[PDB]
Amino acid sequence: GSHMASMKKKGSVVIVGRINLSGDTAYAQQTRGEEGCQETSQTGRDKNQVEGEVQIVSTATQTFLATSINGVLWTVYHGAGTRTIASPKGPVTQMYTNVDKDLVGWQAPQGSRSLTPCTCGSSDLYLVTRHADVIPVRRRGDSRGSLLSPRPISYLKGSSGGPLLCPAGHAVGIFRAAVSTRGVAKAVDFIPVESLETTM
Ligand SMILES: CC(C)(C)[C@@H]1NC(=O)O[C@@H]2CCC[C@H]2OC/C=C/C(F)(F)c2nc3ccccc3nc2O[C@@H]2C[C@@H](C(=O)N[C@]3(C(=O)NS(=O)(=O)C4(C)CC4)C[C@H]3C(F)F)N(C2)C1=O
Ligand SMILES: [Zn+2]
Numbered sequence: 166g167s168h169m170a171s172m173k174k175k176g177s178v179v180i181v182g183r184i185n186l187s188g189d190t191a192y193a194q195q196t197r198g199e200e201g202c203q204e205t206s207q208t209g210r211d212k213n214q215v216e217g218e219v220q221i222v223s224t225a226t227q228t229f230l231a232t233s234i235n236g237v238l239w240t241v242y243h244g245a246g247t248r249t250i251a252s253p254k255g256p257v258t259q260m261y262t263n264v265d266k267d268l269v270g271w272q273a274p275q276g277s278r279s280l281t282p283c284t285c286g287s288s289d290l291y292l293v294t295r296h297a298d299v300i301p302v303r304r305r306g307d308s309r310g311s312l313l314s315p316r317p318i319s320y321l322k323g324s325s326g327g328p329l330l331c332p333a334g335h336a337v338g339i340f341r342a343a344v345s346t347r348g349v350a351k352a353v354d355f356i357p358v359e360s361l362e363t364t365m
Contacts, residue, residue, distance in 0.1 A: 176206030177251040178240075180213065180274070181228070182221035184297050184327070191297040193221065209249060209256030215274040219327060221295055224248065230295055230326035233279040234336045234361060237261065237270040240326035241341060245269045261364050267341050268356050268364065280328060282358045283335030290337055292353060294324040302329060308338070308354055315351045318343055329355050 166172055179202045182195040196213055197205065202223050205211045220231045222240065231240035238250070242264050249256035250271045261270035273279055288304035298320070302310035310329065321343050329338045338355035345351065 175246070175248055176225055177209040177211075177249045177256045178222050178224055178231075178245050179205045179211060179251045180215060180220045180231075181223045183215075183217040184219040184221070184230070184293055184295070185217060186219065186293070187217065191293065191299055193295065193297045195221070205251045209251045210253065211251035212253050215276040216278070218278050218280050219293060220274075220277070222250075222326070228295075228323055230324055230340075232326060232328045232336065232339055233273045233277045234282060234328075234339075234358065235365065236273045236279055237361075237365070238273045238277065239268065239270045239339055239356075239361060241339070242267045242269050244325055250274075263364055266356055266360060266364070268339070268361070270361075270364075280330070280334070280336035282362060283331045283333070283337045285331050285333060285335060287331050289332055290329045291332075292324075292329050292340060293327050294321060295327065296320075302353060304337070305352065307357055308341075309344070309352055310355065311352045312350060315349045317348055318345045318350050319348075321350050321353070329353075 181197045229244040290302040292300040301313040342354040343350040
């Protein structure tokens with residue numbers, strides 16, 4: 166538009182839940198409903214206590230995941246764009262932005278826990294989805310892995326930004342895109358943790 170006085174501001178990304186991995190059972194928890202999410206996106210002020218490594222995040226139009234690794238909350242650019250994230254003292258600007266990698270990052274929220282970058286060199290991985298499904302993935306290249314059991318794309322939608330983990334629970338990568346044919350996801354593409362470590 167040409168009328169700057171009425172130009173709108175995009176809201177903040179908002180943490181609305183988490184994938185609980187602290188015990189023997191993975192499960193999703195919601196920490197904020199849709200109305201409170203809307204309010205928090207506009208103010209950028211989120212007073213909720215943050216816990217865990219994998220957050221469920223939302224904008225006005227999308228929901229996806231974000232994963233703390235080495236004190237940075239990482240997610241995908243196709244979800245967050247250049248948006249700030251809401252925090253107790255207001256909006257927080259991204260400290261990493263790389264559209265070529267489909268990658269953004271903010272300082273990790275106070276109270277969050279960070280995953281350690283994997284140095285195991287192992288190819289037996291586990292994808293964690295927004296529904297707290299743990300999906301075995303065999304690593305097939307620097308940024309690719311195959312599902313041991315393929316599943317319709319619907320079961321992976323909304324899990325970009327989530328982690329691929331090694332058998333020891335280290336972060337190996339961030340889920341970016343799916344490889345699907347006839348609607349069935351047979352493989353996943355992820356941002357390797359080394360690419361995060363280079364971006365850092
Ligand atoms: C056909 C398909 C499955 C839709 C698509 N496959 C696909 O493109 O595969 C090719 C071949 C193998 C790698 C990939 O190379 C292209 C790179 C794509 C990309 F990822 F780097 C990407 N960079 C962007 C940078 C800037 C702006 C937009 C971008 N858009 C991108 O990709 C787009 C988005 C990405 C996506 O849907 N991700 C997921 C997801 O859950 N999102 S989400 O949470 O619902 C949501 C949309 C709320 C945020 C995990 C997959 C879930 F659904 F399984 N896409 C399309 C796909 O996965
Ligand atoms: Zn490891």
